[PDB]
């Protein structure tokens, strides 16, 4: 039984590999060599935030490109006004080690979590004005890595227990749970349709789960090391994955394989975040070399470098409209570039 | 300048006041990371340091300064990822069952893994060989010998510069010093001075438990201020 099942699994893996190789008519480079060059993208710092106390370990852009949520390792969430630089909201968290934060698409709820294994969603438009604990949901036997809002009543979360889960705000329980991975899930990324979302874990693989049914429609198994960041393409047909090997990989849902591997010899420090622009040409990724890079999703050439920070960059995010890009590092300073 | 913008600026200034008031305490605090397997007596240590939650924070004041010890015993076995967030902490207290020789190998493996970590490379790792009475009773009974697990224990001579405590049997002293020597060898390996180990023999009832944390963190901060300020 066990031996027959192992042999069948190996045969299925070999068949999937052969099918993926057959569809690999050519690499993205051969087709992205005719497109005109993107040139150097020299982004300058337009804003400088000096409110955070501890290492910034999360960030996200809500429906409005003016408010920016950022979480610090001291258990503090801060909603900044990107334009005026003012502090729109300050939320003290009961958990000091917060590693994830997201801004609901309605601008009324903000999620957070971390080593506490309890996802806390606070409401910003409460009649009482002050920030109140809207839903402190638990059930995951592991640290929370990332959070993303799907609507004003549901929220997807990934925990260190290797299992992601979509919870309901009103009910405060798992609307659905996905099968466990081989390692701890470290990042999440929602698709523009909100129906599917791809997630990577410590294991060198990324699974594309569905919100309707708890099943990974696709499972890419192409990485050197532990994936630490993942981002969805603005269209929803591809997605970038970044690990600690200092190499990003752009996988495709239609082709079901890697398109181009963004890597360089002079870059040896791992990656911590990945993000795209409103168009997708500029792929932004923060590296452990105390800086961020911006490559061409098509040409794969180094388009820009951001070395304003002084500590290891922790997270970065592009606005929904693409006017600027926020970057939070361990230097307790968040910088907006444009 | 609009009035709403001025009110928002005033609210931001108040939030900055509060953030500075909190950062004062933050900077003035000392974060400690308690690590240890299930067999380790970390629970007994937390119970003694009284001067689905994957994190447990415990604040205790010693010599008029606070210490926030963080225990993590409700998470998955592997800890190569969530351990990175605990950088820049004051110290790391590793617990090990010095009496149970069976789990000593896994304890040393975990200690070496936590020491050679790339992110915690510059973080000191304090060591409390808890459960000393059990180890003494075991080595005195003679039913369990460390030689069965470690052959070097058969060809290991008692340190000449040792400091046997009053009333300790030669076998107990030799065993504890061999354990300490093994730990110091595993620590100094690729240490480079940026981080050094602090082993201390902790009993199960010794009230002078947080005092060890204080004395270790004092030297840790002393070396950190000698290095950063270019005096060593």
């Amino acid at each position: 039984e066990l031996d027959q099942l192992r042999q069948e699994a190996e045969q299925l893996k070999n068949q999937i590999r052969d099918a993926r190789k057959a569809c690999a008519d050519a690499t993205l480079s051969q087709i992205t060599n005719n497109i005109d060059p993107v040139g150097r993208i020299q982004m300058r710092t337009r804003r400088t935030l000096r409110g955070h106390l501890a290492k910034i370990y999360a960030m996200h852009w809500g429906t409005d490109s003016r408010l920016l949520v950022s979480a610090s390792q001291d258990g503090k969430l801060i909603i900044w006004d990107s334009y005026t630089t003012n502090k729109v909201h300050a939320i003290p968290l009961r958990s000091s080690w917060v590693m994830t934060c997201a801004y609901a698409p309605s601008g009324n709820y903000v999620a957070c979590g971390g080593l506490d294994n309890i996802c806390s969603i606070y409401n910003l438009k409460t009649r009482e004005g002050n920030v109140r604990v809207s839903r402190e949901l638990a059930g995951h036997t592991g640290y929370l890595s990332c959070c993303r809002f799907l609507d004003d009543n549901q929220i997807v979360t990934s925990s260190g227990d290797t299992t992601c889960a979509l919870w309901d705000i009103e009910t405060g329980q798992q609307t659905t749970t996905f099968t466990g991975h081989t390692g701890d899930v470290m990042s999440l990324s929602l698709a523009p349709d909100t129906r599917l979302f791809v997630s990577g874990a410590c294991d060198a693989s990324a699974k594309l789960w569905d919100v309707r049914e708890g099943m990974c429609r696709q499972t890419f198994t192409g990485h050197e090391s532990d994936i630490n960041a993942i981002c969805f393409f603005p269209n929803g047909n591809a997605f970038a994955t970044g690990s600690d090997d200092a190499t990003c990989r752009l996988f495709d849902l239609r082709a079901d394989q890697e398109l181009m591997t963004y890597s360089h010899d002079n870059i040896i420090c791992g990656i911590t975040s990945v993000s795209f622009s409103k168009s997708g040409r500029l792929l932004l990724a923060g590296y452990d070399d105390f800086n961020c890079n911006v490559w061409d999703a098509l040409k794969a050439d180094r388009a820009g470098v951001l070395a304003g920070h002084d500590n290891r960059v922790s997270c970065l995010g592009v606005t929904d409209d693409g006017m600027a890009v926020a970057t939070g590092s361990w230097d307790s300073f968040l910088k907006i570039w444009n | 300048l609009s009035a709403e913008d001025k009110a928002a600026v005033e609210r931001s200034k108040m939030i900055e006041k509060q953030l500075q008031k909190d950062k004062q305490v933050y900077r003035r605090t000392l974060r400690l990371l308690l690590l240890g397997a299930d067999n380790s007596g970390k629970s007994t240590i937390v119970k003694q340091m009284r001067i689905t939650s994957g994190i447990f924070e415990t604040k205790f004041q010693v010599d008029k300064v606070n210490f926030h010890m963080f225990d993590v015993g409700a998470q998955r076995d592997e800890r190569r990822k969530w351990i990175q967030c605990f950088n820049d902490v004051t110290a790391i207290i590793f617990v090990v069952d010095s009496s149970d020789y069976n789990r000593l190998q896994e304890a040393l493996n975990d200690f070496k893994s936590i020491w050679n970590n790339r992110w915690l490379r510059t973080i000191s790792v304090i060591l409390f060989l808890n459960k000393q009475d059990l180890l003494a009773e075991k080595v005195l009974a003679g039913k369990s010998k460390i030689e069965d697990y470690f052959p070097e224990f058969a060809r290991y001579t008692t340190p000449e510069d040792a400091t046997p405590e009053p009333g300790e049997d030669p076998r107990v002293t030799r065993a504890k010093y061999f354990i300490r020597k093994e730990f110091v060898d595993i620590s100094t390996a690729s240490g480079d001075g940026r981080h050094i180990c602090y082993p201390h023999f902790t009993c199960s009832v010794d009230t002078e438990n947080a005092r060890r944390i204080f004395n270790d963190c004092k030297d840790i901060i002393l070396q950190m201020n000698l290095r950063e300020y270019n005096l060593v």
Partner: single-chain antibody
Amino acid sequence: VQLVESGGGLVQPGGSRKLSCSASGFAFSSFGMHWVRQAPEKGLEWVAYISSGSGTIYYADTVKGRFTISRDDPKNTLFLQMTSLRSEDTAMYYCVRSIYYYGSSPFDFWGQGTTLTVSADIVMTQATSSVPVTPGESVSISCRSSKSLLHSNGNTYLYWFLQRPGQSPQLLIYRSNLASGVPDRFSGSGSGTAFTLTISRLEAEDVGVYYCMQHLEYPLTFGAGTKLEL
């Protein structure tokens, strides 16, 4: 959320009085307070404003010197001490909460207020003061201003307050952006000079006085107010 005012009554000329306001159901310190007066058979008129933490205070050019506002945060209370009360001071005073930030709705909750009887800023002028209309039809109230409220930032500093018989003014619009707790029937349009409040379907609860307010500059000034009756 409640703002209970007290201290009103009859006062002789030249006297003094401390009007108190107890706030509950929210963080009193987080919301700036505004004392606004309404004369009998007339519209509203801003009096004083105190920011959070008492870091900033403002008064109207006509009320400076006499009235002084203060706030006790430990007790979540507001106080307004008036001295040398004149004959014109006869009016009903209301305490209003307002928090200022992107996406907020300043002046969202109006207190019940208390009546006290005796014995170059931007001006808002409305065309019509009373418009007869029955349920089922739509209403279009107009408003004119002497200075363009469109600031360089692009925010429309226009506030609409609906005061019903026996109730306090209720916020309808704070910036086209509908206010909280108000149905979608009310809408706002216009440029920085002219403004229009449109009600698509009238109801029995819509009868009342609609007042317009500008917030470009700290010194405020309410309009005459347009009345809608059955």
